Amino acid sequence: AEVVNGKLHLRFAIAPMRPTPSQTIKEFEPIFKYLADQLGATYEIVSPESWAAISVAMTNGHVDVGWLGPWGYVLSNKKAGTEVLATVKYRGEPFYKALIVGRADLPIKKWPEDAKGLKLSLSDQGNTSGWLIPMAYFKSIGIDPASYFEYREGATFGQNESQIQHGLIDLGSDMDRGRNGMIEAGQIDPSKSKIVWESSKLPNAAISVPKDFDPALKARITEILTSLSEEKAQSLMGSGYNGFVKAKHSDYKVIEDAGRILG
């Protein structure tokens, strides 16, 4: 962050919460514009296609305020001391769940013991719900996805849902709040898929700043976001996202723990 020609400038970044960067920016830029306006700041914004990429951007000093996925925040905190200021609310709650979605007609009565050799697609290794949590689940039951499934990694949630719907894979990861938004936007036909597995509750996205971020600004940003009403917040964000709660590192313990156990 710097003051340019007397005017504060902020660099924003948004994780790939919606299926494409343009959708993500169109739907969530307004909360960032609001934030910048409360500070009298200019801004710039990007939304990378992968979850790992926004973590790396924050770690490598390119981002003043980032909306990071949980594992992206934990990784960046470990590497660079990135600080979480607040957690986003979805339907009024600072949590969400990971999914494994399957084709609607997939036999699953003995899941996942009846799924050997099926085509499973996980997301990039920076994706909490899309990679970290499902990998932790398989490892907890002694399954190595790369040798158990016809396995692919690195897909986006948009690719996973599309490929399931069109019969190109059997199984793919998603997150509940993400799937909800895709159904609400008419982007998938939910008759063609079903939830096969859901995780326990996970902490939601981490509104994050670099380690040495200006303390006065940090405090203002936190108050600006957390003081929003549900109605005002929702007016500025994609459907379902409707506020922020003050957060700290220990709120992400379950994610840190999962990452540790996977090495």
Curated annotation (Swiss-Prot):
One of its GO terms (cellular component) is ATP-binding cassette (ABC) transporter complex. InterPro entries: PhnD. GO terms for biological process: transmembrane transport. Gene3D superfamilies: Periplasmic binding protein-like II (3.40.190.10). Keywords: Signal, Transport. The keyword Signal applies. Pfam families: Phosphonate-bd. The keyword Transport applies. Probably forms part of a binding-protein-dependent hypophosphite transporter. PANTHER family: PHOSPHONATES-BINDING PERIPLASMIC PROTEIN. Belongs to the phosphate/phosphite/phosphonate binding protein family. This is Probable phosphite transport system-binding protein HtxB. The lineage of its organism: Bacteria, Pseudomonadati, Pseudomonadota, Gammaproteobacteria, Pseudomonadales.
